[PDB]
Ligand binder design. Structure first.
Ligand SMILES: C[C@@H](NCCn1cccn1)c1ccc(F)cc1
Length: 330
């Protein structure tokens, strides 16, 4: 089997991407944030505290002929950004882009934090990290990918995120029309449950490439690129007037600037992030200070190749017995 679904940025900054997902029978279509940095498929639902719902589409298990309560199971998750949600669990039929899984754990939110309520465009998350991170208790559940792998033509999915444009998630095949050149594959550690890999170095603009190992995760659910303070300082030193603002919570730069590109290594290959991808616009409406898309990881504990980095590439998440990542330019 394969599936192919379009993913669409939620706003003009590419802060997140939503992908339609069919849940239940008859189908209930919800727009989910596909998140390679977590392992729970959770949704706004008929169970979500009414005051915490503001515009989202909800899943109503009682209207699905295929829904069943996963009796006794609960879940609770918090993300890197301090957001959280929790609830109970149903199993139901879930389809993405024409690929169907039966018996998928659909985690129904009873509570969501303010950051989810305030974003009316995201109806829940679909986790695509390793199932060892799934938060369902007392019986951990599998991701949609982990359940689909029993059926896919090839045990892979690919992320092809757009810059201020739609892109694609494919399951079970690699679209050789979607990238240029060749795909460079690199080793993955699953020790922390993430798609964790080691970049071979970086360059700033037209500068020399610095060969240096940078461990980090490929995380479609994180907007920005979080790297070591040394790397980030070297980047922003090339932008006149850029500074790390303690009042704003990272590097800001004059909105009049032209940003340099940023290159990261994948083995002997190089992925170039254009400078405009690193522009996240005014810090507040009408401001002439703009927020940077490359930020320090020093207060996280891990480096994160978020959307800023991933949308410069065609990315293969190889879930073969020994998982690997592939990157191609596009
Ligand atoms: C609550 C939420 N924001 C969606 C992303 N966004 C960035 C700026 C605005 N929206 C979220 C939190 C964590 C996460 F892994 C996914 C989604």
């Amino acid at each position: 089997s394969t599936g192919s679904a379009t993913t669409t940025p939620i706003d003009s900054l590419d802060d997140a991407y939503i992908t339609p997902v069919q849940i239940g029978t008859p189908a209930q279509t919800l727009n989910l944030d596909f998140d390679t940095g977590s392992s729970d498929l959770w949704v706004f639902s008929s169970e979500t505290t009414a005051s915490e719902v503001d515009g989202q589409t909800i899943y109503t298990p009682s209207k699905s002929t295929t829904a069943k309560l996963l009796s006794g199971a609960t879940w609770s998750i918090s993300y890197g950004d301090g957001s959280s949600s929790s609830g109970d669990v149903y199993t139901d039929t879930v389809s993405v882009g024409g690929l169907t899984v039966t018996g998928q754990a659909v985690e129904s939110a009873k509570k969501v934090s303010s950051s989810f309520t305030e974003d009316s465009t995201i109806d829940g998350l679909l986790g695509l990290a390793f199932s060892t991170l799934n938060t369902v208790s007392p019986t951990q559940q599998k991701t949609f990918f982990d359940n689909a792998k029993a059926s896919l033509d090839s045990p892979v999915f690919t992320a092809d995120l757009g810059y201020h444009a739609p892109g694609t998630y494919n399951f079970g095949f690699i679209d050789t029309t979607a990238y240029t050149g060749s795909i460079t594959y690199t080793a993955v550690s699953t020790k922390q449950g993430f798609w964790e890999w080691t970049s071979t170095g970086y360059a700033v603009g037209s500068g020399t490439f610095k060969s240096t190992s940078i461990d980090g995760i490929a995380d479609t659910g994180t907007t920005l690129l979080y790297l070591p303070a040394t790397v980030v300082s070297a980047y922003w030193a090339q932008v006149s007037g850029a500074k790390s603002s303690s009042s704003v919570g990272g590097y800001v730069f004059p909105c009049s600037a032209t940003l340099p590109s940023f290159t990261f290594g994948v083995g002997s290959a190089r992925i170039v992030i254009p400078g405009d991808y690193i522009d996240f616009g005014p810090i507040s409406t009408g401001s002439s200070s703009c927020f940077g898309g490359i930020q320090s990881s020093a207060g996280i504990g891990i480096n994160i190749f978020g959307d800023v980095a991933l949308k410069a590439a065609f990315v293969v998440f190889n879930g073969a017995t020994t998982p690997t990542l592939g990157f191609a330019s596009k």
